[PDB]
C-alpha cells in the first residue's frame, strides 16, 4: 500500500484513482501524519507527497523527506518540498496556469522506464525548483522549466513538477508504476 | 461560461441557444473532455451533461459527476448518468416517444424558483431513474415517472428527465436560469 500525504490539492483523489488503475492500493492521510506512524505499518511500501496550495503549510513533509527510509515521490508542491528539504531552492515562475507541457527525458533512471523520451504532461509552473539540491540529479526538463523531474543520486527519493495522476499526462500511470516498482510492486 | 458535454443527442445545440436567450455563454465540448481541463479554465462556472442515445457511451460523464466541484445539471441521459454514478438505478420504461408531459413540482429548491407548481415539459421516457441514489432527493414527478427531476441534498448536482432547452417546455429557460444562478450568474 502507498500512503499519500494530502497537501490539500485538487488532484489528491486522482493519485489514489490512478494507482487503483494499475492494481496498487493507497491511503490518503493528513499531511500532519507523523513519520513513525507511517513507517511502523508494515503494509506501507512508499510515500507520495501530493500537490497543494502552500509550501509554508506542509512542513511535516520536510521531516518525512529528510528522514523516511521508504521510497518517496513528490508531485508539484511535493517535488518543491523535497528540494527545499535537501537545501535546494524553490521560487516563483511565469507560466502559472495549468497546461500541456512537452517534457524531455534526460535520464531514464527509474521513473521513465518504458516511457518515450518525450511526452506531454499536465503541469502548472507557478513555482519551480530553481536550484537542484546537492546530491540530486535532473531527470527531465521542458522548454520553460529546467527541472520537470529529479531524484536523489542513490536514495529512492523522486520529484516531478507535473501531475502523472491525471489523464492528460501521457504515460502518467506508467511513471506511477515505475515508482511502485521501486517500492517492491511487481507488474506483468 | 457553461460547458456542455455533448452526449450525441439531438437537442445539444438547443441547450446553447436557450442559454444565449437568457444571456449566458456556453461551449459545447466532447463528452470525453477530461474534468481537469474543464475545471482549470477559470471562465467555467458549471457543467451540463446533455442528452444522447447511449448510456454505455458516456462514462467520462460518470467521472465528472462523481468528482466535479462545479455545479452540474444532467438532462434526460445526463440525469440518468448522474443517478448511475452515485449508485442509483436506471432502466427501461414504457413511454418511449417524445411527448408533452405534465410535471408536478414536489420541492421548489433551486431549479423551480419562479416556476409554477405544475407545468408542461417535452420529454421521452424510454429510460428513467428507477431508484434515486442515496443522498439525493426527488424534486418533481409526472403521472408516468416518479423522478422527473432530482438533486443531491447538499451538493449542486441536479437532474431533469425532460428537456428544458426546447420551446415546448414551459418555463424551460427559467429552469436553466435557476441552474445558472447556482453557478453564480445574476439576473435582473
CATH code of residue B84: 3.40.50.880
Q: Give the technique used to solve this structure.
A: X-ray
Note whether A11 contacts B40, CB cutoff 8 Å.
Answer: no
Q: How far is A107 from chain B (nearest CA, A)?
A: 28
Give residue for cell 429552469.
B175
Note whether B37 contacts A168, CB cutoff 8 Å.
Answer: yes
CB atoms within 10 A of CB A20: 11
Note whether B36 contacts A97, CB cutoff 8 Å.
Answer: no
Catalytic residue among B128, B165, B170, B174: B165
Provide the domain count of chain B: 1
How many residues are given for chain B?
A: 188
> How far is Cα A73 from Cα A186, in angstroms, rounded to an integer?
18
Give residue for cell 459527476.
B65
> How far is Cα A8 from Cα A154, in angstroms, rounded to an integer?
30
Which of B40, B43, B59 would best serve as a mutation to test chain A binding (most A beta carbons within 10 A)? B40
Task: Supply A168's cell numbers.
Answer: 492528460
> How far is Cα B152 from Cα B7, in angstroms, rounded to an integer?
22
CB atoms within 10 A of CB B133: 18
A25 touches A17 (CB < 8 A): no
A170 touches A164 (CB < 8 A): no
DSSP-derived secondary structure for A19-33: HHHTT--EEEEETT-
How many Cα atoms within 13 Å fall on the side-chain side of residue B105?
18
Paired residues of B68 in beta bridges: none
Give residue for cell 535532473.
A138
Domain that holds residue B164: 1-188
B99 touches B72 (CB < 8 A): no
CB atoms within 10 A of CB A134: 9
DSSP-derived secondary structure for B79-98: HHHHHHHTT-EEEE-S--S-
Whether A94 is a known active-site residue: answer no
CB proximity A20 to B under 8 Å = no
Q: Which long-range contacts (CB under 8 A, 24 or more apart) does B54-59 make?
A: B54/B8, B55/B80, B55/B81, B55/B84, B55/B90, B55/B127, B57/B7, B57/B8, B57/B31, B58/B5, B58/B7, B58/B31
> How far is Cα A108 from Cα A115, in angstroms, rounded to an integer?
8
Q: How far is A74 from chain B (nearest CA, A)?
A: 20
How would you class B24 by CB atoms within 10 Å of its CB: exposed for 0-12, middle for 13-18, buried for 19 or more?
buried
CB atoms within 10 A of CB B188: 2
Nearest to A109 by CA among A153, A57, A144: A153
Task: Look at residue B40 and give its three-state secondary structure.
Answer: helix
> How far is Cα B16 from Cα B26, in angstroms, rounded to an integer?
6
> How far is Cα A91 from Cα A93, in angstroms, rounded to an integer?
7
For chain A, how big is the Rg over CA atoms in Å? 15
A120 touches A164 (CB < 8 A): no
Paired residues of A2 in beta bridges: A26, A46
Note whether B36 contacts A168, CB cutoff 8 Å.
Answer: yes
Question: How is residue A64 annotated by DSSP?
Answer: H
Task: Supply B15's cell numbers.
Answer: 441547450
Task: Supply B100's cell numbers.
Answer: 408533452
Whether A163 is a known active-site residue: answer yes
Whether A36 is a known active-site residue: answer no
A163 touches A121 (CB < 8 A): yes
> How far is Cα A167 from Cα B18, in angstroms, rounded to an integer?
32
Q: How far is B179 from chain A (nearest CA, A)?
A: 24
How many residues are given for chain A?
A: 188
DSSP-derived secondary structure for B17-36: HHHHHTT--EEEEETT--HH
CB atoms within 10 A of CB B68: 17
How many Cα atoms within 13 Å fall on the side-chain side of residue B12?
21
Chain A residue numbers touching B40 (CB-CB < 8 A): 97-98
Bridge pairing between strands B118-123 and A2-6:
unpaired
Task: Supply B72's cell numbers.
Answer: 452540474
Amino acid at each position: 500500500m502507498i500512503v499519500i500525504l494530502d497537501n490539500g490539492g485538487q488532484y489528491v483523489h486522482r493519485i489514489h484513482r490512478s494507482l487503483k488503475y494499475i492494481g496498487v492500493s493507497s491511503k490518503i492521510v493528513p499531511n500532519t501524519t507523523p513519520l513513525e506512524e507511517i513507517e511502523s505499518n508494515k503494509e506501507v511500501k512508499g510515500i507520495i507527497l501530493s500537490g497543494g496550495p502552500d509550501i509554508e503549510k506542509a512542513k511535516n513533509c520536510i521531516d518525512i523527506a529528510l528522514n523516511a527510509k521508504l521510497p518517496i515521490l513528490g508531485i508539484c508542491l511535493g517535488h518543491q518540498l523535497i528540494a527545499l528539504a535537501y537545501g535546494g531552492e524553490v521560487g516563483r515562475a511565469e507560466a502559472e496556469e495549468y497546461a500541456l507541457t512537452k517534457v524531455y527525458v534526460d535520464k531514464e533512471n527509474d521513473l521513465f522506464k518504458n516511457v518515450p523520451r518525450e511526452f506531454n504532461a499536465w503541469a502548472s509552473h507557478k513555482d519551480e525548483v530553481k536550484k537542484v539540491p546537492e546530491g540530486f540529479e535532473i531527470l527531465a526538463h521542458s522548454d520553460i522549466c529546467q527541472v520537470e523531474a529529479m531524484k536523489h543520486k542513490t536514495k529512492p527519493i523522486y520529484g516531478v513538477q507535473f501531475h502523472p495522476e491525471v489523464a492528460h499526462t501521457e504515460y502518467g500511470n506508467e511513471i506511477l508504476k515505475n515508482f511502485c516498482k521501486v517500492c517492491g510492486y511487481k507488474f506483468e
